[PDB]
Design a protein around this ligand. Sequence first.
Ligand code: GSH
Ligand code: GSH
Lengths: 237, 236
Amino acid sequence: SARSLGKGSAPPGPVPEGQIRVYSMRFCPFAQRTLMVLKAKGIRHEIININLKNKPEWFFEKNPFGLVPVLENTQGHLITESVITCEYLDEAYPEKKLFPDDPYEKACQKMTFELFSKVPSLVTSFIRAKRKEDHPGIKEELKKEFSKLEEAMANKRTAFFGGNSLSMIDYLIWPWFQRLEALELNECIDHTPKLKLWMATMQEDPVASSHFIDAKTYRDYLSLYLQDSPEACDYGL
Amino acid sequence: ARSLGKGSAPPGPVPEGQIRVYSMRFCPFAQRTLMVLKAKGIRHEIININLKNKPEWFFEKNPFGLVPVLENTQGHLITESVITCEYLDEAYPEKKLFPDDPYEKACQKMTFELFSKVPSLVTSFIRAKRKEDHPGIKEELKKEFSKLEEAMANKRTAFFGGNSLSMIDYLIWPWFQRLEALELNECIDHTPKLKLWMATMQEDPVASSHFIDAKTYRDYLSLYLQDSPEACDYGL
Ligand SMILES: N[C@@H](CCC(=O)N[C@@H](CS)C(=O)NCC(=O)O)C(=O)O
Ligand SMILES: N[C@@H](CCC(=O)N[C@@H](CS)C(=O)NCC(=O)O)C(=O)O
C-alpha cells in the first residue's frame, strides 16, 4: 500500500538483505499471484508499486516490456512473468512448497492450470470493450472456459484445484475469480456450482484475501485506468 | 508406424522400463516430446493417432483428444506438450535440458514466453484461404519473430538458453523447421541470428530425426485441411 513510483522517481536502492523485491501494482491480478505466493511462503519482501500509466523510465531497466510483476533479488537477478516468478519462488525458496513434489502430481496441476489459460485475455477484452454495449460474445466465451473449470473440479471432487489443501494452482487462477463481482460478470458463473463454492472457500484463506478491494473502489480504478489516468494505480490510497 | 484409428485395438499396457507417447508424425507439439524423449535416451514406444479418424479409446487417454499424451508403465497420463517435456526432465534427470539455477531456468522460461503466440499464428496462417492467405498474419509473425531475434542478439549465444542445446531450443524448434514448407520464409528475412540458429538446429541429430521434406509436409497439410483419414499416415 505504498504510493507507486512514476516518471521522474529515484530508482530504488539495492534490495535489502534477507529480502526479495517485487515490482507490483495494487490492482494487477498477475502481480497478485506473486504477492500471494510471496506471502503464503513467508518470504521477506519489499513491494515497489509501479505507476503503469506514468512509468518511471528506469523501470524499463527492470523489465524491457514494462509490465509487472517483476522480481529483483539481493543478487540483482530480474525475473519476469507472473507464472514464472511464482515458479522461481517455489524453487529458489524451497521452504513451504506450493507445488507438489511428485512430477506426475505437479504435472497434473499444470494441466489443470491450462484450463484457465484463456481467461485473462477474455476478462481483459471484456474490460476494454464499449461500456454501454453489453457484449454477450465475450461473456459466452468465459462461460465455456469456466465450464471446463467447473467440470475439472467436479472430477477431482476436492476442495481446491490441486487437491485437498491450497496449492499453487489456486493462487494462480484466483485473482480473476475474485474480480468477477466488481466486473459484473457473476452470470458467467451461474452454471458453475463447484466454482462458486471454491470462490467462497478462497475468501477465507488469509492470503487470498489479504489485499481485498471492495467492488466499488475497483470499478472506479478501472474507470481511471481505461482513461490512462496517472492516478489509477494509486487510487484508494 | 501406421496411425491407430477408429475400430483399432487399444494398445496393451505400457511395457516396464518404457514410457508410451501418443503422437502424430507431423504434429509440431508432439515433436517436442519426441525430441525430448530422444535427446534424453529415454526408452519409449510411439503410438501415432489418426487425428482425422480418432479411435474412440483415445479419449480415455485424453478427454480432449489431442496429442501428445504420455503414458507410463504405471498408467499415469500426462497431457500438453510443454508439460510432458517438463515432466520428462523431472522424472529422468539423465541429460538435463533445463538448467539447475532457478534464475537461469526462469531466464529460459522467460525466453520461451516470446514464442507463445507463434503456434496459434501459424495455425491461423495454415487454415486461411489458400489463394490470398493474409499478409496481416505474416506481419504478426514478423513482429513476434522480432522479439526472438532481438532476444538472441541480446544473449549473443549459439542457442537460446546459452551455448549448448537447451529445452528452450527444442520447445520452439518445430515451428521454425516448418517455415520452409509453409512458405513463411519471408517472416524471418530481418532475423539474421534466427536463420543462423535454424541452420544449426538442422545439424543437431535430434532436431533432424525423421526428417520431413517440405513437399511431403505440404501434401500432409493438404490432406489434413480436407479431413482426410490418410493425412496422418501419408508418406509411409
Ligand atoms: N503475462 C504477464 C502479464 C502482466 C501484465 O499484463 N501486467 C499489467 C498490469 S495487470 C501491466 O504491467 N500493464 C502495463 C502495460 O501493459 O503497459 C504476466 O503474467 O506477468
Ligand atoms: N496445446 C496442445 C496442442 C496439441 C495439438 O493441438 N495437437 C494437434 C496435432 S498438431 C491435435 O492433436 N489435433 C487433433 C484435433 O485438433 O482434433 C499441446 O501443446 O499438447
